[PDB]
From TrEMBL:
Name by which UniProt lists this protein: SefD
Organism (species): Salmonella enteritidis
Domain of life: Bacteria
Keywords: Signal
Length: 131
């Protein structure tokens, strides 16, 4: 069982609304095994599979995210996100704040187990474009 990610390169001329996808995770070699999905990162108390990430430069900079997707449902424990199906390949990463995010690089940790294994990290850099 291995977990890959991908983080879409994008330019936002307008405040990024909540639940805009900002990347994807892909699964491999776990067929026929229930799957948890969460992270070692801070917890958005309000929502499962939703996390706060802190700025590498200045830790006051916060980036709120949410993992999930259409075959992915929250656990009542408020741990993470569980897909039962054995053909569930992909899952999404969502922004989950109201609007802009400070200019900084944020480290995003995600792991996946079998429920009753793997982890990953991708640097997510925010920069300002002056045109």
């Amino acid at each position: 069982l291995k977990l890959m990610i991908k983080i879409n390169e994008a330019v936002f001329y307008d405040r990024i609304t909540s639940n805009k996808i900002i990347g994807t995770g892909h699964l491999f070699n776990r067929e026929g095994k229930k799957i948890l999905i969460s992270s070692s990162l801070e917890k958005i108390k309000n929502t499962p599979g939703a996390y706060i990430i802190r700025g590498q430069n200045n830790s006051a900079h916060k980036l709120r995210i949410r993992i999930g997707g259409e075959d992915w449902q929250p656990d009542n424990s408020g741990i993470g996100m569980v897909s039962h199906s054995d053909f569930t390949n992909e899952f999404n990463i969502y922004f989950f704040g109201n609007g802009d995010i400070p200019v900084d690089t944020y480290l995003i940790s995600i792991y996946a187990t079998e429920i009753e294994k793997a982890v990953v990290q991708a640097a997510v850099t925010i920069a300002a474009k002056l045109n």
